Amino acid sequence: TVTYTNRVADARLGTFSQLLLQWKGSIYKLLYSEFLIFISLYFAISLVYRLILSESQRLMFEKLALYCNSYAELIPVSFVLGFYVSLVVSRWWAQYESIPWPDRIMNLVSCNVDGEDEYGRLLRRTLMRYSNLCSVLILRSVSTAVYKRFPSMEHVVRAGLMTPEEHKKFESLNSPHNKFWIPCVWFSNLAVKARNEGRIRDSVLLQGILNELNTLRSQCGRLYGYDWISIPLVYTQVVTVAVYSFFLACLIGRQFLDPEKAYPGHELDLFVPVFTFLQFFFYAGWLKVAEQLINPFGEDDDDFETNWLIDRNLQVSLMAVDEMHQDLPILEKDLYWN
Amino acid sequence: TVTYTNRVADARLGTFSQLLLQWKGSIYKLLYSEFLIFISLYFAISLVYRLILSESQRLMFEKLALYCNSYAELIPVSFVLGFYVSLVVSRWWAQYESIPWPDRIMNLVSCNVDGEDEYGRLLRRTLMRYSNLCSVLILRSVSTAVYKRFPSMEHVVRAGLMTPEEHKKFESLNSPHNKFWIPCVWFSNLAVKARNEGRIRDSVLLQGILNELNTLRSQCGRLYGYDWISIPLVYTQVVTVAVYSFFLACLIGRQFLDPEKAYPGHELDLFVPVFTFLQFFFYAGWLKVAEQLINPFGEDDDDFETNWLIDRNLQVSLMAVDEMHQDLPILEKDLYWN
Amino acid sequence: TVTYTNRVADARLGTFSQLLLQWKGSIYKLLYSEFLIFISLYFAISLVYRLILSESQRLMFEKLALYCNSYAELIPVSFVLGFYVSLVVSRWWAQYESIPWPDRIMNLVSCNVDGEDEYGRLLRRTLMRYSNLCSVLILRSVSTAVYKRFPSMEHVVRAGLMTPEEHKKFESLNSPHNKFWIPCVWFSNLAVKARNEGRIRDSVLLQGILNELNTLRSQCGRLYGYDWISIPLVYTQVVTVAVYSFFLACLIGRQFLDPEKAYPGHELDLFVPVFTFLQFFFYAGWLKVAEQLINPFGEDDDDFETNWLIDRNLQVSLMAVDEMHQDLPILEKDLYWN
Amino acid sequence: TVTYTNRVADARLGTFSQLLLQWKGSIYKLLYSEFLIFISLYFAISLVYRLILSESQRLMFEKLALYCNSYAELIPVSFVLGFYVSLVVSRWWAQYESIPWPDRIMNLVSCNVDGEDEYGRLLRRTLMRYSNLCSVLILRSVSTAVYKRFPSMEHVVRAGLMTPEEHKKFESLNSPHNKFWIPCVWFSNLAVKARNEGRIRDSVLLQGILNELNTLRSQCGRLYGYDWISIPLVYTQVVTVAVYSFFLACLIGRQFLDPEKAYPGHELDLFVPVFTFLQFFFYAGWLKVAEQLINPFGEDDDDFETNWLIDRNLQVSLMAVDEMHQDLPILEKDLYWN
Amino acid sequence: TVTYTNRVADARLGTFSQLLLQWKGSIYKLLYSEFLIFISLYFAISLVYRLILSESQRLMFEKLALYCNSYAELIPVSFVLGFYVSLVVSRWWAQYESIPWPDRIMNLVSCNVDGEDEYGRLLRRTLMRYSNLCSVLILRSVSTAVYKRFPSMEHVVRAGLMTPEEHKKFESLNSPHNKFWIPCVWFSNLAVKARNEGRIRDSVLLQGILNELNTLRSQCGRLYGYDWISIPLVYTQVVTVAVYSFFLACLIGRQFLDPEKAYPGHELDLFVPVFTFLQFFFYAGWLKVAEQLINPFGEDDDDFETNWLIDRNLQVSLMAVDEMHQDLPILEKDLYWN
Ligand SMILES: [Ca+2]
Ligand SMILES: [Ca+2]
Ligand SMILES: [Ca+2]
Ligand SMILES: [Ca+2]
Ligand SMILES: [Ca+2]
């Protein structure tokens, strides 16, 4: 994503006036193809009408242009497009919050799994690596950036997210469905094995660890649900037919007619319709935002930084349960004692 | 459902332009009947007006067409239809999330119910089969696809979801209401019987299993509530009268009149109203999406894949508590040790 | 409620076309009075204008009709009415989900309260009867159907929901406020008395039972809040003044004037305004849905089936803690063993 | 609040027609001042125009009235006002549900704090009085009705909500901020002191009591947040400038011009603009509802009955933990035994 | 923020009429620059047109002004701007509720961590200082006011929020990412160290403290998510291009033309367009509210008072676990005893 929050804290004058001077993740980069196609088609029809057509053929084109200008308002562009964009934005922010963060499981495993020797160290690192793997295996199914980072499971083995013994156990488990739920069972079995060996003191701490595991499992299930149940295809087809049909009508209807014929409405000849191009800018770019945000896990400039987030979660998770287990600062008095 | 999420990750040019070349679950398959009925009625009235009516009768039809063109805008089509479609889409996504997933109960039963012999194996499989049966018995009441897969309870017995002794116990329980709550009591009684025999260690683990049982029971209750309390019938009647009355008016009002009579507005004769057919496309198809999604558990192309989900839940549930109980990979060091 | 979900699973052709042939809970049954009053007033003014008024008086009525037709669009009908109907529908579905279901408490009491003799049987039945009574005493305060089923507390005694000793204890408790919270204290005291006698094993199971009791108490409190804090009366007055003032203006403005006077707009005389009657149909019926759903606990055709739900909850609750305590089917192998 | 829910259960004919015959909490009581000011200003300008101005001055007033009638539609009244009213209603119902109800803490304290002697009786009453005081001290900060009931802390002492020793301890605690969090710490300390003396059996019951304490603390924190973070003042200024500027324009633009001058639009002279007064009624009263509901804790007719609710909570809380501790009815058989 | 809730409790007459006489946090302070730029540009173009241009050049400017007045309505200002402002307000109130409040952790630590000597006092103060530091370290990353209060970590050391030993431990932990999660691991490790020394009695109280820690960690994670995932930049660019392009068109289109030329629409010459300036006021100020509230953690007049809240949380947290540990008032009888 493009983050500009620190630039818009106060509202002086050019709070939004400077942000339109940015190229990375802009409206200009999105509309740079469709806008130039629209410019090319409009100026092509304009030059053909001004330089090629005969007089009766121009007189027929005038009636066609008046018909298309009168009756292009029957197409419900804003009515369909606002509803579709509201769906896309609602599902967008709903899909951000479904991304699993390891930090609650991190806080519980960093303190409740005892042992300062190598066995408890290995145990805590294996628990957090299972919690991260149960996230990576669903993020490589819902995202294309993670899938291009990890094309096969051997790339998950080489990155250190999975040992080859876990790869052999993962391949030996026979299931035709998506196997993202495999480490979230290994986590619970390893937590119970840790409790039975005395590394976890009581049942309440074990049940807290398992509750946070099931919370992360619900997060991964929400990601699977938002990826599998898309926006219905019939909505996408209706909105693209709406925008493309409206501006296909505006290719003919918004053409500058002859001022010497003295039509009502077409009195000035400017050869560049500023308001038609602005209306195409707002409607077509308003559709392009929904095209960008309908899948926020791809490789757009404003899709989610999933690979960075995987690297952060792996580093922070393996940091807080290895170096920070019983490594506390010295309990000292504050500036407010007596 | 038709899933196209992997095709719309990035937004290059034809992100939505290729998706209108798809037939399965499209606007075209929905409107293929109503659109051709509208085309047939319009061209029938057009040919009758052009070839059959006498001159005074055509002059009366002209006044009828001008009246219907002037006063068809009084019908609040968009105002009623947007509100109705917003209800349908909100209830649609609310009904997806109410579908019970066994995975939290799966994670707890796979680890907390002890025993590697045949008795604990039978116990875990019976617990997960009760948790799946308490979902199947409500999905065959809210869906028509599951009801056509399982027409009677004997088909539930033959699929392995229920043993015949459980069928006899299920028939001996006398209740005139829906019996989907029967396995969700058997689960709690079998969990307490498992705790009393020592298969579950403490009370906290038992209460966690019962809390996830009650969570799945709340999911099934939400499905029962959304199926039983429909959208009010008066809304459905008002929206279908709105769309059908508006286009019944547009059968007469949008007719191309005679250009030689020189009416204001009807100057060009094209014999095919492109914008009337587009307006019928958007409004009527916008109603057809609500017709499709008012019950997302039927057998439309974009209703929910409930039978696939039942098969997945049964296979994954009986997999993770039988093969994956204490079958863990070897605890080995990572690529980040020292 | 009228349930039609099983009829609209697929979307073939007449998915909504058959549902307008139904009378029970329709738009026709709602508007059958107001629509005929509007028809009567319009045709009365029409016949008086056509047969009674003199020429200068008709000429004054023409100017009054043109004024009322020009200036009835200043009344914000859709703007106020859409906001009001959105409130009514949001509160409608929010009030359905606040109805207490005994099933979570049923699942916990059916398994955690021990004893196969008559004392534990009496104990479980008394606990579930308290949980049902704490729901009946708020449903007879928020609904008129339950209040007509149970006019006094003696009718609650005769139905078996309350023994006469509990009636005497309920009357001896002195409080000027609504006493729906009385059985939800008796439940907690009886659960603690059951724990102290050894019928409940540990504290965790008791706390789970009390947590589900407090969940049902929050459900009853939400019902009390939605009944006591209505939609503000000023909104109801503004919407009824809006609809009635707009169609009081349309009684005069939509009248067919004389075509021989040649007014702009009034050229055709049909004597039955189809689009005025349709506009009255949609706006007035859109108000009548809000009139129906502003209190969904009354005795409309599409209000909630509260009495049926009370009977179901009583039967299922006293069934699952009496016959189904330790009555489990035989643990047998599945079709997938080895 | 004005409650009319029992009057609108069914929808016969006059379901909303009788509710406009009510004065308490009506649109008429709100608009009785602003409407008469608008009537006075309009009729003043009308009589001055009809009786005082000369002919050229009337001819200038005609052009001013046509300008103001043509260009008053540029003011976005409905666009700003609908958004503002939606915020006010959303925050209104969000602030009702944040009002703390003592009933969950009541159910736990009435059963889990042991002792039938005077010490446990005093202990339970002191716990519930702390839970009520932690609500009263935030309701006298967010409401003006509670602040006029309790102007100082001595009025809280005289009402029995606080003993004078608790008043001295409350004054000895030095903090420049709002002290509504003081009894919600006393509750937890007294619950731990009750557990350490054996009045509470185990830790799980104590943690349940503390969890419901923190739930009530979150309710009080939501009330503090909704009172402290208002709707932004810039929205309130924009909506009042919108409504007042639009009807300041309509004082001149809606004036009946001279019919003998024969302007397009002003042909009939009625001297009382019915639709202008109706439009002022709906827009200005639609603003007055937001003025009423922007602070629903004041002393309007449809603000919340906070003092009644404080009296109810105090009476019910001190009732259910004193008289109803181990005072249960006799366990007797039902009408459905065998 | 500017709080005016106590001024708008009742609705008499001038409930909103007095609030437009306030300068701090008003629409006037926001629009004081852009409005004067618009006034300057409009009056500059007006004086140039009235005093400088020749007759044919004025005749060309008339056609340009009629074109820009006819075709500036094609720009979807309200359609884009309402959607954007709805996003800004929804995210605004969603970001207020994500601010962590220490009070639940305060209530649990003030009672469950035993010890009246200096060691338990130091232990409770260190726990609450960790809970406050885990909030300060994310509020100095999401806000500019806290970042200007604490430019470096030495300023956090000097304020008493962090001892220098904790500063050395905080710098020794090597991580390239944001370190706001560091004290929320120290809290859990210190709570487990407090439990193992006997300062916390059982496991249930420890798990309650850790659950409230993870709740505060989820609050800080929501703040990090709302700061990192902004509103998409393409929406901000489209709305600022919409407002600026519409009023750039209105600089030419709303100009008062010559009345002697007798154009339809431009008949009166007033030299100050009141309704154009009002329309600029509402649209441009409606954009400026979104500019103010897109980052509510900056230093605007109506952004959140974050520094005051940090000071309050520090004072109240270190107050309630030091002075109020076992300092209870005397248990005395109420006014309602017998
Ligand atoms: Ca994307
Ligand atoms: Ca369907
Ligand atoms: Ca009703
Ligand atoms: Ca108020
Ligand atoms: Ca700001």
Residue numbers in the entry:
A (entry chain C), B (entry chain D), C (entry chain E), D (entry chain A), E (entry chain B): 2 to 339
What does the paper say about this structure?
BEST1-4 proteins are expressed in the plasma membrane and form Ca2+-activated Cl- channels by assembling as pentamers. The channel comprises five BEST1 subunits arranged symmetrically around a central ion pore that is ~95 Å long. The diameter of the pore varies along its length and contains two constrictions, the ‘neck’ and the ‘aperture’, both of which are lined by hydrophobic amino acids. To address these questions we determined a series of cryo-electron microscopy (cryo-EM) structures of chicken BEST1 with and without Ca2+ in activated, deactivated, and inactivated states that represent the major gating transitions of the channel.
In an aim to obtain structural information on an open conformation of the channel, we used a construct spanning amino acids 1–345 (termed BEST1345) for cryo-EM studies. BEST1345 does not inactivate because it is missing the C-terminal inactivation peptide. Importantly, whilst it does not inactivate, we have previously shown that BEST1345 possesses normal Cl- selectivity and Ca2+-dependent activation. Single particle cryo-EM analysis of Ca2+-bound BEST1345 revealed two distinct conformations of the channel. The second conformation present within the cryo-EM dataset, which represents 14% of the particles and is determined to 2.9 Å resolution, contains a dramatically widened pore within the neck. Based on discussions presented herein we conclude that this represents the open conformation of the channel. In the open conformation, the neck has dilated to approximately 13 Å in diameter, which is more than sufficient to allow permeation of hydrated Cl- ions. Conformational changes in the helices that form the walls of the neck (the S2b ‘neck’ helices from each of the five subunits) underlie opening. The conformational change moves F80 and F84 away from the center of the pore and involves rotation of the neck helix along its helical axis (~15 ° clockwise viewed from the extracellular side) and outward displacement of the neck helix that is more pronounced on its N-terminal end (~2.5 Å at F80). When the channel opens, the first α-helical turn of the neck helix unravels such that I76 packs with F247, F276, L279 and F283 in the open conformation and has shifted by approximately 10 Å. The repositioning within the neck also exposes the hydrophilic residues S79 and G83 on the neck helix, which had been secluded behind the F80 and F84, to the pore in its open conformation.
